[PDB]
Amino acid sequence: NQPYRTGFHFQPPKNWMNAPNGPMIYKGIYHLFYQWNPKGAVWGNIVWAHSTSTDLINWDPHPPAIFPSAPFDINGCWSGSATILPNGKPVILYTGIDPKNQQVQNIAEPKNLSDPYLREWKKSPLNPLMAPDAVNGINASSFRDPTTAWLGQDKKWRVIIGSKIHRRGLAITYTSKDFLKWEKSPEPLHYDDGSGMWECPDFFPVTRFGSNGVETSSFGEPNEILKHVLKISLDDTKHDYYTIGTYDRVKDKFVPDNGFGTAPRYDYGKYYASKTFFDSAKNRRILWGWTNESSSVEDDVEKGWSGIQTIPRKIWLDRSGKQLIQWPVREVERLRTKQVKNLRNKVLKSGSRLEVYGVTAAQADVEVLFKVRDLEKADVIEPSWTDPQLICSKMNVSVKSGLGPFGLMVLASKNLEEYTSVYFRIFKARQNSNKYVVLMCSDQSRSSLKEDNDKTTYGAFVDINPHQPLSLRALIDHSVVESFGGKGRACITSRVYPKLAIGKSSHLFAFNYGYQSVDVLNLNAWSMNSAQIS
Ligand SMILES: *[C@@H]1O[C@H](CO)[C@@H](O[C@@H]2O[C@H](CO)[C@@H](O[C@@H]3O[C@H](CO[C@H]4O[C@H](CO)[C@@H](O)[C@H](O)[C@@H]4O[C@H]4O[C@H](CO)[C@@H](O)[C@H](O)[C@@H]4O)[C@@H](O)[C@H](O[C@H]4O[C@H](CO)[C@@H](O)[C@H](O)[C@@H]4O)[C@@H]3O)[C@H](O)[C@H]2NC(C)=O)[C@H](O)[C@H]1NC(C)=O
Ligand SMILES: *[C@@H]1O[C@H](CO)[C@@H](O[C@@H]2O[C@H](CO)[C@@H](O)[C@H](O)[C@H]2NC(C)=O)[C@H](O)[C@H]1NC(C)=O
Ligand SMILES: OC[C@H]1O[C@@](CO)(O[C@H]2O[C@H](CO)[C@@H](O)[C@H](O)[C@H]2O)[C@@H](O)[C@@H]1O
Ligand SMILES: *[C@@H]1O[C@H](CO)[C@@H](O)[C@H](O)[C@H]1NC(C)=O
Ligand SMILES: [Zn+2]
Ligand SMILES: [Zn+2]
Ligand SMILES: [Zn+2]
Ligand SMILES: [Zn+2]
């Protein structure tokens, strides 16, 4: 039996999964490739497994598309991206491991451009198109994950590749006139000292005002204003960070509008190796993200699988322009049951809980609107409290604040032996203005009776005004919780493995352990139907 397998998240029928690869749309069909281990449930024998969808929620399997077959990828087929050439033709740039264990860059073309499921791919004999050597002096063990490519004003292709010199992470830029002969730019698009290896770089334009995505190559009209995003996966910290900034076409350099570190993450919990693509069908940019297991490696081997992708999110620039907003693709809403469980104008007094009934609690979508009564009852933040994760760590739900904790017990046992808390605290900011600080925590210290699991607590700040009602959403899916505070302004994914709170035996609460009572304006819980995934 498989109590931890998800009913509506992407995962292979079995075995190991990590980074999402080459996502794209071709002929109105969504593709996902992914790092897969056909043999075991740990990392190894890494191939590009392949699935397709018409809605990003339901996925049909297909045989691996890119696996070791030539000198340029004999030892493995690591991450990479698909670019759509201006004639509609899709191509994949990916890292291969050559016979000398060097990380080289390889191209793949589809074999039959009339196959709408793009089943089979052909690799040029001219690969590697891009390799470390003695001239360029690139570290051969640190030259991976090409991005989607963007065509410049000079009709010349750009692509970046994640790397590092010493402790210096950088994005090595390559330019091409024809997409077959790539020459290394003398200059990195960007670099940061003391960061370490830059994995899974991503680089895409985003609109200054609007929710709609931007074609990756689009130019910044004097009448339509664009900003650029650079996303990196830091091998050392194991997190994804982005920075908003201007792309100087002349220099070919990314300049983050400081400050901009102190850098934002897409997701403040378990989330890594993320990658975007342009959904040309609906003009949105979609973000894919890998959430690995928090269980022991011992358990992965026993259950026979490891790793899932989050629900893919629509991503756009917030009005302030200081951060990105994410929100689960609207298609996942189709999985909702018809009978919505609703609760209005309820009062959660100090130390109270309110069970949501009549919803499959291990497989649900839930949205709360909290409202605080009197902001002047908020504790002033301690001057030293600047790391949101450490704040949530020290003050568990048992520690009372003026305002908070209030939020949700999810994947909870009847008598709360096991529960995962996704909650808020409100503070008054340490400055002359009447600014407030909203804290969002994902607490999984008491999420499972088995101690073996990674019970690390996650935290994020939310840029919303608590004069307004506080918004919280949670997608609950057996062993994964995806929490969104402030309508997508703060995202936290976590992985919990309850011993008691399983399937029919799991419950859903809204709670409040603050000193002050808070109002639940509105709460909606939908049971979530299963998806058709390989
Ligand atoms: C794939 O999944 C892997 C497992 O899920 C994952 O690796 C795991 O990563 C997490 C972090 O995301 C590791 O977290 C554990 O947390 C403890 C340290 O926490 C301290 O700092 C935290 C903030 O970073 C706070 O939340 C805590 O309060 C705590 O704070 C104390 O210390 C700080 C600074 O030192 C100080 O400021 C405070 O005052 C506090 O005193 C540790 O206890 C854990 O150590 C454990 O793991 C190692 C394994 O090598 C072993 O020594 C033991 O098992 C030990 O229990 C740990 O750091 C977690 O450990 C990781 N697990 C493993 C097996 O590596 C991996 O990141 C995922 N991959 C991707 C790509 O997402
Ligand atoms: C090139 O990058 C590689 C990959 O990170 C470096 O190898 C690691 O760092 C040192 C080697 O001096 C060792 O402590 C580790 O064993 C290596 N990492 C692992 C576990 O694979 C290498 O140092 C870099 N080379 C140079 C000269 O920059
Ligand atoms: O599967 C390889 C693929 O994964 C990434 C990002 O998830 O790197 C992971 O795997 C590497 C190969 O062992 C590790 O060195 C690295 O620490 C880990 O994050 C990509 O960089 C790579 O293309
Ligand atoms: C590719 O095009 C279509 C795929 O649907 C198929 O009818 C045809 O046989 C394929 N072409 C060949 C010969 O590979
Ligand atoms: Zn289908
Ligand atoms: Zn920087
Ligand atoms: Zn960390
Ligand atoms: Zn006020």
For the chain, what are the domain ranges?
Answer: 13-336+529-534, 337-528
- Considering all CA atoms of the chain, what is the largest pairwise distance in Å, rounded to the nearest integer? 69
Tell me the CA distances in angstroms from 460 to 386, 394, 443, 510, 513, one per residue in order: 10, 14, 12, 20, 19
Q: Which helix (H) or strand (E) holds 301?
A: helix 297-303
Query: Does 292 sit in the ligand 1 pocket, CB within 6 Å?
Result: yes
How far away, in angstroms, is 142 Cα from ligand 2 center? 9
Pocket test for ligand 3, best of 18, 145, 275 (most atoms within 8 A of CB): 18
Do residues 486 and 324 touch, judged by C-beta distance below 8 A? no
Which residues crowd ion ligand 5, with CB under 5 Å? 60
Give yes or no for a cis peptide into 259 (omega within 30° of 0): yes
For ligand 1, pick from 456, 492, 493, 496 the residue to mutate: most ligand atoms within 8 Å of CB: 456
| Contact (Cβ atoms closer than 8 angstroms) between residue 96 and residue 127 | yes
210 contacts 218 by C-beta, under 8 angstroms:
no
- CATH fold match for the domains 13-336+529-534 and 337-528: no
Q: Is 199 in the pocket of ligand 3 (CB under 6 A)?
A: yes
Burial class (CB in 10 A: 0-12, 13-18, 19+), 343: middle
Whole-number Å distance between alpha carbons of 534 and 57: 11
Query: For residue 100, what are the contacts with CB-CB under 8 A and spacing of at least 6?
Result: 140
Ligand index nearest the alpha carbon of residue 198: 3
How far apart CA 20 and CA 50 sit, in angstroms, is 10
Ligand 3 lined by 145 (C-beta under 6 Å): yes
Q: In angstroms, what is the span from residue 12 Cα to ligand 4's centroid?
A: 27
Helix (H) or strand (E) holding 264: none
- Taking CA atoms only, the protein residue closest to ligand 2 atom 17 is 141
H or E element at residue 384: none
Q: Residue 434 CA to chain centroid, in angstroms?
A: 33
Closest to 490 measured CA to CA, from 299, 323, 353, 338? 323
| Atom number of ligand 1 nearest to Cα 18 | 71
Q: Beta strands of 265-307 (E only): which ranges?
A: 272-279, 284-291, 305-306
Q: How far is CA 421 from the centre of its chain?
A: 20
Distance 192 CA to ligand 6 centre (A): 5
3-state per-residue secondary structure call for 388-414 = HHHHHHHCCCCCCCCEEEEEEEEEECC
**What is the C-alpha to C-alpha distance for residues 370 and 361, in angstroms, rounded to an integer?**
20
Q: How far apart are CA 108 and CA 93, in angstroms?
A: 7
Method: X-ray
Ligand nearest to the CA of 200: 3
| Data resolution in angstroms | 2.8
Q: Which of 275-296 are b and which e, b meaning 16 or more Cβ less than 10 Å from the residue's Cβ? A: bbbbbeeeebbbbbbbbbbbbe
Strand partners, 191: 170
Specify whether the CB–CB gap between 461 and 438 falls below 8 A. yes
Among protein residues, the one with the nearest Cα to ligand 4's atom 13 is 112
Question: What residue has token string 């004069």?
Answer: 467
Assign domain 13-336+529-534 to its CATH superfamily. Glycosyl hydrolase domain; family 43 (2.115.10.20)
CA–CA separation, 140 and 30 (whole Å): 33
> Minimum-distance ligand to the CA of 144?
3
Query: Counting ligands in written order, which one lies closest to the CA of residue 533?
Result: 5
CATH tag for 337-528 (out of 2.60.120.560, 2.170.8.10, 3.40.1280.10, 3.40.50.150): 2.60.120.560
Pocket test for ligand 2, best of 43, 142, 167 (most atoms within 8 A of CB): 142
Assigned token pair, 454: 């990674």
Find all residues with CB under 8 Å of 114, minimum gap 6, and list them.
none
Nearest-angstrom CA–CA distance, 286 and 467: 31
Pocket test for ligand 3, best of 35, 67, 143, 306 (most atoms within 8 A of CB): 35
| C-alpha 433 – ligand 8 centre gap (Å) | 11
Angle at 256 between CA 185 and CA 265, to 5 degrees: 110
Q: Is the CB of 19 under 6 A from ligand 3?
A: yes
CA of 365 to the centre of ligand 2 (A): 44
Closest CA to 176 of 166, 161, 193: 161
- Decide whether any atom of ligand 1 lies within 6 Å of the 379 Cβ: no
Q: Which residues surround ligand 6, an ion (CB under 5 A)?
A: 192
Write the CA distances from 452 to 132, 362, 493, 499, integer angstroms.
Answer: 41, 21, 19, 12
Ligand 8 geometric centre to CA of 382 (Å): 20
Contact indicator for 378, 449 with CB cutoff of 8 Å: no
Cα 60 to ligand 5 centre (Å): 5
Q: Whose CA is nearest to atom 4 of ligand 3?
A: 19
CA dist 23 and 29 (Å) reads 11
Q: Which of 454, 479, 493, 495 to mutate to test the pocket of ligand 1 (most atoms within 8 A of CB)?
A: 454
Which residues does ligand 4 sit against, CB inside 6 Å? Answer: 112, 114-115
On the 0-12 / 13-18 / 19+ scale of CB atoms within 10 A, 194 is exposed
